[PDB]
Amino acid sequence: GSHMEYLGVFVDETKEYLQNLNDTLLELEKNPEDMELINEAFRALHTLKGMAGTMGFSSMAKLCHTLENILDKARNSEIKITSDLLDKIFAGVDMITRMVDKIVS
């Protein structure tokens, strides 16, 4: 086992969660009040945050935390999922994608 090997595992796992977050958010847009879908997105972001933390990837962890906070507000009905919000969430998903792809670049 080497660090580069485990970086490969990290990127593979993170890509699964980023794909989930794409699937979930496409359905959320069809019913932005669906709390289960909000929860799905929250859970994926929270998992990504925790993975980044165990690797010491500070910027990725803090980005995942900022994004998880949006979904956490939404799951407690503090804020509504709007088009604009969705743009913000998708932008963060896309930035994490770019970060993850950079590891293996």
From Swiss-Prot:
Protein name: Chemotaxis protein CheA
Cellular localization per UniProt: Cytoplasm
Organism superkingdom: Bacteria
Function: Involved in the transmission of sensory signals from the chemoreceptors to the flagellar motors. CheA is autophosphorylated; it can transfer its phosphate group to either CheB or CheY.
Residues the record lists as Phosphohistidine modifications: H46
Domain HPt: 5-103
Residues of the full protein shown: 4 to 104 of 671
